[PDB]
């Protein structure tokens with residue numbers, strides 16, 4: 079078996095985000111539980127990526143996972159320079175370069191699940207004004223923002239959407255103040271797509287009580303605020319990391335040198351309802367799932383950047 083092997087994991091910021099980074103740790107710990115492999119987990123930061131990952135290498139890791147686009151260039155450099163080490167990255171963002179054979183990149187079509195979140199929030203909102211709180215801007219987050227705004231307009235052409243960015247995935251207090259300002263300005267539902275920062279958005283909703291709703295992200299976040307999180311736009315990082323790593327442990331060769339793309343139809347993303355609010359939002363949830371099937375069948379082409387969004391809006 080694979081018991082002698084080691085799989086390592088490096089994230090940016092804290093593991094304990096109730097979402098994206100946490101899901102990567104869940105996968106690695108489940109691999110340890112099921113296969114009895116060795117694991118190493120490291121929470122890192124930009125000023126020390128190079129040293130932290132060089133250390134996972136020196137621990138003779140058989141596979142090193144990096145999580146999130148902020149690790150893109152470092153994971154690429156280390157893979158390029160260490161041909162005998164295998165690396166995989168969740169959401170590497172690369173422009174010019176060709177991916178080396180010992181690096182596997184995973185890309186999620188986040189705009190697809192964000193479209194479901196926007197459609198849902200737009201149908202559910204009583205004020206007709208909804209919010210989006212993002213983490214760090216860039217290609218990944220813009221896919222969430224434009225997918226959300228497009229799905230919202232698809233549900234109601236005159237929907238009002240307020241978008242703000244915390245600017246980091248690790249500022250809970252700024253998530254809270256951003257959300258508090260939105261709720262005070264007539265927003266009644268906020269999609270928090272902001273890592274740990276978004277948990278502060280949830281805190282703001284809890285502090286304001288009933289009628290301040292959240293669309294959660296990455297994992298089912300209804301348990302964080304069972305009266306306020308209506309639905310969650312999940313990203314199935316843990317399932318994918320487990321299955322890809324298990325295959326790698328069986329073959330010993332990384333299926334790398336490429337980017338694997340996952341959206342709704344690959345079961346890489348999904349929309350998960352809070353059962354405590356079922357009687358009240360089930361009809362909208364079911365309509366949202368039909369929208370998801372239209373996306374999966376290629377009927378709705380979901381925008382993901384400014385150009386595709388502006389075209390989508392003009393062609394509605």
Ligand SMILES: Nc1ncnc2c1ncn2[C@@H]1O[C@H](CO)[C@@H](O)[C@H]1O
Nearest residue numbers: 090091098146147148247271272273
């Ligand atoms: N530490 C992080 N680093 C990079 N991207 C992140 C991080 N946390 C969250 N994200 C991204 O923001 C989205 C919403 O939390 C996630 O699905 C992921 O794409």
Ligand SMILES: [Cl-]
Nearest residue numbers: 250251252254
């Ligand atoms: Cl605070």
Ligand code: NA
Nearest residue numbers: 249250251252
């Ligand atoms: Na804080």
